[PDB]
Structures are given as structure tokens and as C-alpha cells.
């Protein structure tokens, strides 16, 4: 609610293992269209200005 975004969107943001070719668990970076759709979903709840 604070971010004005859907809970599954929050879950997707948290699930981002930003590891970028190892040194940690795994690279959970979404695909290009998944990134685009996630950005649309998280941005859809803003104002006009």
C-alpha cells in the first residue's frame, strides 16, 4: 500500500536475486518482456503530473 503497488508485484521485486552471473545463490534476473510487464504493473498506480 505504501508503494501503491500490488502484493504480487512486491513479491516479484523481493524475489529479484540480483546476482548477475554467480558469486551468490543464482541469477534470478527476469527476461526482457517480464521486466517490461513488471515495470508496467509497479508504475500503473501513480498520479498524472
Amino acid at each position: 500500500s505504501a508503494l501503491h503497488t500490488m502484493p504480487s508485484v512486491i513479491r516479484t521485486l523481493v524475489n529479484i536475486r540480483y546476482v548477475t552471473a554467480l558469486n551468490k545463490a543464482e541469477s534470478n534476473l527476469p527476461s526482457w518482456d517480464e521486466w517490461q510487464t513488471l515495470a508496467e504493473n509497479m508504475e500503473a498506480g501513480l498520479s498524472t503530473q
Partner: protein
């Protein structure tokens, strides 16, 4: 006119509210009603509604 007098609504808004549809093809020299409602601004891609 009645809605414009009390609720202070635009002509297109009150026309749609009383039972008409949103005019996608306005006089076209400026923004139409459909574009004013869902294209201010388009998020990333062109509108397809």
C-alpha cells in the same frame, strides 16, 4: 446540462454519464475524450483498447 449545472462536469463527461459512450473521434484538433482519459500519457506502448 443538469449534471454540468450541479456536479460541474464537462459536456462529454455528463454525456457519457447519462448513458452515451466515450467519443474516441473528437474534433481531432486537440485531445479527444478517450485519449484524455487513457493517454495522459501512454505508459510505454501505444494504446490498444
Amino acid at each position: 446540462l443538469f449534471y454540468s449545472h450541479r456536479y460541474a462536469l464537462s459536456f462529454d463527461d455528463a454525456q457519457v454519464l447519462n448513458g452515451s459512450v466515450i467519443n474516441q473521434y473528437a474534433d481531432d484538433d486537440s485531445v479527444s475524450h478517450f485519449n484524455r482519459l487513457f493517454n495522459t500519457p501512454p505508459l510505454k506502448g501505444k494504446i490498444f483498447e
